[PDB]
Each structure stands twice: as structure tokens, then as C-alpha cells.
Enzyme design. Structure first.
Site, PDB file in Angstrom:
ATOM      1  N   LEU A   1      90.658  38.326 -61.379  1.00 59.06           N
ATOM      2  CA  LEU A   1      91.126  37.486 -62.499  1.00 59.06           C
ATOM      3  C   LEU A   1      92.254  38.112 -63.355  1.00 59.06           C
ATOM      4  O   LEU A   1      93.123  37.380 -63.826  1.00 59.06           O
ATOM      5  CB  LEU A   1      89.945  37.041 -63.394  1.00 59.06           C
ATOM      6  CG  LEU A   1      88.898  36.121 -62.732  1.00 59.06           C
ATOM      7  CD1 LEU A   1      87.705  35.957 -63.618  1.00 59.06           C
ATOM      8  CD2 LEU A   1      89.475  34.751 -62.365  1.00 59.06           C
ATOM      9  N   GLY A   2      92.239  39.432 -63.532  1.00 60.77           N
ATOM     10  CA  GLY A   2      93.248  40.144 -64.306  1.00 60.77           C
ATOM     11  C   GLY A   2      93.031  41.642 -64.350  1.00 60.77           C
ATOM     12  O   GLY A   2      91.893  42.103 -64.376  1.00 60.77           O
TER      13      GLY A   2
ATOM     14  N   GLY B   1      91.240  48.977 -66.935  1.00 62.37           N
ATOM     15  CA  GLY B   1      90.338  47.837 -66.819  1.00 62.37           C
ATOM     16  C   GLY B   1      90.809  46.775 -65.849  1.00 62.37           C
ATOM     17  O   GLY B   1      92.009  46.610 -65.620  1.00 62.37           O
ATOM     18  N   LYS B   2      89.854  46.079 -65.246  1.00 56.30           N
ATOM     19  CA  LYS B   2      90.085  44.973 -64.316  1.00 56.30           C
ATOM     20  C   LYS B   2      88.968  43.922 -64.475  1.00 56.30           C
ATOM     21  O   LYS B   2      87.831  44.270 -64.804  1.00 56.30           O
ATOM     22  CB  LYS B   2      90.258  45.454 -62.860  1.00 56.30           C
ATOM     23  CG  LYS B   2      88.971  45.915 -62.144  1.00 56.30           C
ATOM     24  CD  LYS B   2      89.085  45.759 -60.620  1.00 56.30           C
ATOM     25  CE  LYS B   2      87.750  45.776 -59.907  1.00 56.30           C
ATOM     26  NZ  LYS B   2      87.261  47.156 -59.641  1.00 56.30           N
ATOM     27  N   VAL B   3      89.303  42.646 -64.263  1.00 55.57           N
ATOM     28  CA  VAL B   3      88.366  41.527 -64.431  1.00 55.57           C
ATOM     29  C   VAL B   3      88.211  40.715 -63.133  1.00 55.57           C
ATOM     30  O   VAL B   3      89.210  40.364 -62.502  1.00 55.57           O
ATOM     31  CB  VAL B   3      88.757  40.657 -65.666  1.00 55.57           C
ATOM     32  CG1 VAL B   3      87.958  39.359 -65.735  1.00 55.57           C
ATOM     33  CG2 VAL B   3      88.590  41.456 -66.955  1.00 55.57           C
TER      34      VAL B   3
ATOM     35  N   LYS C   1      84.282  42.521 -66.319  1.00 54.65           N
ATOM     36  CA  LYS C   1      85.262  43.524 -66.689  1.00 54.65           C
ATOM     37  C   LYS C   1      84.731  44.897 -66.272  1.00 54.65           C
ATOM     38  O   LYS C   1      83.611  45.279 -66.638  1.00 54.65           O
ATOM     39  CB  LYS C   1      85.553  43.467 -68.202  1.00 54.65           C
ATOM     40  CG  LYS C   1      86.547  44.538 -68.664  1.00 54.65           C
ATOM     41  CD  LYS C   1      87.465  44.054 -69.778  1.00 54.65           C
ATOM     42  CE  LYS C   1      88.325  45.202 -70.215  1.00 54.65           C
ATOM     43  NZ  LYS C   1      89.114  44.910 -71.431  1.00 54.65           N
TER      44      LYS C   1
ATOM     45  N   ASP D   1      95.976  43.241 -79.602  1.00 52.19           N
ATOM     46  CA  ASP D   1      96.507  42.749 -78.324  1.00 52.19           C
ATOM     47  C   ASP D   1      96.520  41.197 -78.344  1.00 52.19           C
ATOM     48  O   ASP D   1      96.128  40.546 -77.369  1.00 52.19           O
ATOM     49  CB  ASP D   1      95.621  43.303 -77.174  1.00 52.19           C
ATOM     50  CG  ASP D   1      96.151  43.227 -75.746  1.00 52.19           C
ATOM     51  OD1 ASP D   1      97.382  43.210 -75.569  1.00 52.19           O
ATOM     52  OD2 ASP D   1      95.330  43.263 -74.805  1.00 52.19           O
TER      53      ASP D   1
END
Ligand SMILES: Cn1cc(Nc2nccc(N3C[C@H]4CC[C@@H](C3)N4C(=O)[C@@H]3CC3(F)F)n2)cn1
Length: 281
Positions: free
Chosen positions: A15-16, A21-23, A42, A130
Site C-alpha cells: 500500500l505504501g 516503514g512500509k504498509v 504498518k 507530515d
């Protein structure tokens, strides 16, 4: 109840990403009948673990209509943040596919929603750091939510700002001058980033009208080192992102209010709420 076994967290698609970090879209299917619910997970990019562990403490202590819902954790040494999956994605992926569907009335309703969520963050004593459209998720054509808290910091009681120590890769084109100059983050710094997110929203997140794309036509070629110094000079000279095409005076004047050089002169999130609501009949 609030725990998630890694073995039941069936991986579907990415997803991102970030830098630490990664989702992912996972289905939590402990029955094995493929009937479990889809969730956003996440996790850490292949430390850095306490950074995510602090993000868990923040999202766990957050409960709002316009803030992505916390679901739980998946423990391994390591840890994962489990939240609700919003299939429409963020505004960045949504808005270019819906230029015809989303009118000014709808964007104004998204602004209110982003502001109520941000104001509730301010009340819990946090600074987001952010606030960009890439972090604003679409729940339906009527509902938006803040979807990441990866650089969110708590403001010490009785203090007005948080001073960032390390700050390895922050979104400098969404930053107020206090952040760029003193590494200081106020609630008023979040207001400025809203103005910028609003500009993105009004430009249907058109890639070549993004804060980066536009500011690099006012600053020119620079590279990592000089980016911030030139950015500060532009803003010091009163220069600001221009009124998006078709944007009415009333909306841009509320956007300009977020962009007062000094944190103390900027509008509050409650004033933006009342301000946008007055334009919705
Ligand atoms: C493309 N897409 C995404 C969904 N849904 C969905 N539901 C919840 C959270 C979520 N997030 C993706 C993005 C936006 C906020 C944060 C979580 N993501 C990030 O990129 C974080 C920085 C990092 F990677 F950790 N995405 C559908 N399509």
C-alpha cells in the site's frame, strides 16, 4: 482481542513505503475460510523499532471520525501496527480519478474533516509534522481520515513546541519557516501544512502542481543540501504558492491565513472549521 498473529495476517498487496516503514493490505483470516477482514499493516522496512512502538502509543491514544482507526498489534523483538483498510487509497490516488465527481462543495467538506481530525490531534497535545494529501485517506466520496502518524510528536506540557533532534527525511515543501529555520514544530506549523495540503486538494493532486514541482520553479536546481536555504529565502520575501485555477477568493484567503510567516499570526484549526463551514450552504 486486540492481538493479531502474524500467521493469520495473509499478505495481499503493498500500500505504501517510507524509509523506516512500509504498509500492506492483509486479510486477518484465523478461521481459514477466506472470510476474515482486510486490514492495513504498518511494519519496518528491511533500528528504528521504538520509532514504530511510539507510533503505536500515539494511534492507540487516538479515537476520532477523521483519524484512521487503530485495530491492534502483531508481535514477533519486532512489532507491527494494525489499522483499518480504506480501499479508495489516499487523496493522491483518489482525486486524479475523480476530477469530474469531486466539486468545490466536496473539497470544502474534506477541508473541514482534515481540520476536525487535526484539531483533535492538537487537543491530545500532538504535532503531526507530515500533513500532506498522501497521508489523507478516502473512506467514501463523503469521508476522509488522517492515515499516518510516523513523525507525530507530543508537545511537553506548558511548552508551545517540540524541537526535532535527528530529522533525517522530513517533507520540507510542506514546512513552515519555524521548522525550516529552528527545527521547531508548533500547532501553527501543522496549520501551514494544512494550507499546502488544501492547495494539493484544490489542484486534484495534479502531479505537476504539487508543492515540490512548483517550488522548484521558484528555487530551481538545488539538491538536498541547498533546498531548505533557498526555500526559506522565497518565504522570507513573502512568496507563497498561488491561488489554484478556479479557486475562489474566500477559500484562498483562508489558505493565505495558514501561511503567515510567524506561528502566532496564523489562524487556528477551529477558525478554519467555522471559516469553511460558512461557505457550505
Ligand atoms: C494505496 N492505498 C492505500 C489504501 N488503504 C489504506 N488504508 C489504511 C492506511 C493506508 N496507508 C497507506 C499510506 C497512506 C497512509 C499510510 C497508511 N501509508 C503510508 O505510505 C505510510 C508511510 C508508510 F508507508 F508507512 N492505506 C488503499 N489503497
Amino acid at each position: 482481542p486486540t492481538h493479531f498473529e502474524k500467521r493469520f495476517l495473509k499478505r495481499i498487496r503493498d500500500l505504501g513505503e517510507g524509509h523506516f516503514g512500509k504498509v500492506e493490505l492483509c486479510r486477518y483470516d484465523p478461521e481459514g475460510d477466506n472470510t476474515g477482514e482486510q486490514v492495513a499493516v504498518k511494519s519496518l522496512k528491511p533500528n528504528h523499532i521504538a520509532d514504530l512502538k511510539k507510533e503505536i502509543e500515539i494511534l492507540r491514544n487516538l479515537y476520532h471520525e477523521n483519524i484512521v482507526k487503530y485495530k491492534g498489534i502483531c508481535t514477533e523483538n519486532g512489532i507491527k501496527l494494525i489499522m483499518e483498510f480504506l480501499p479508495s487509497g489516499s487523496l493522491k490516488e483518489y482525486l486524479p480519478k475523480n476530477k469530474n465527481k469531486i466539486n468545490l462543495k466536496q473539497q470544502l467538506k474534506y477541508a473541514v474533516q482534515i481540520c476536525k481530525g487535526m484539531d483533535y490531534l492538537g487537543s491530545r497535545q500532538y504535532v503531526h509534522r507530515d500533513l500532506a494529501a498522501r497521508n489523507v485517506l478516502v473512506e467514501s466520496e463523503h469521508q476522509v481520515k488522517i492515515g499516518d502518524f510516523g513523525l507525530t510528536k507530543a508537545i511537553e506540557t506548558d511548552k508551545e513546541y517540540y524541537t526535532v533532534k535527528d530529522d533525517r527525511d522530513s517533507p520540507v515543501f510542506w514546512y513552515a519557516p519555524e521548522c525550516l529555520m529552528q527545527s521547531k514544530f508548533y500547532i501553527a506549523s501543522d496549520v501551514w501544512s494544512f494550507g499546502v495540503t488544501l492547495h494539493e486538494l484544490l489542484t486534484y493532486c495534479d502531479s505537476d502542481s504539487s508543492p515540490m514541482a512548483l517550488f522548484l520553479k521558484m528555487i530551481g536546481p538545488t539538491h538536498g543540501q541547498m533546498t531548505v536555504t533557498r526555500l526559506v529565502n522565497t518565504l522570507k520575501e513573502g512568496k507563497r504558492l498561488p491561488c489554484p485555477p478556479n479557486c475562489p477568493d474566500e477559500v484562498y484567503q483562508l489558505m493565505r491565513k495558514c501561511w503567515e510567516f510567524q506561528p502566532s499570526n496564523r489562524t487556528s484549526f477551529q477558525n478554519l472549521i467555522e471559516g469553511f463551514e460558512a461557505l457550505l450552504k
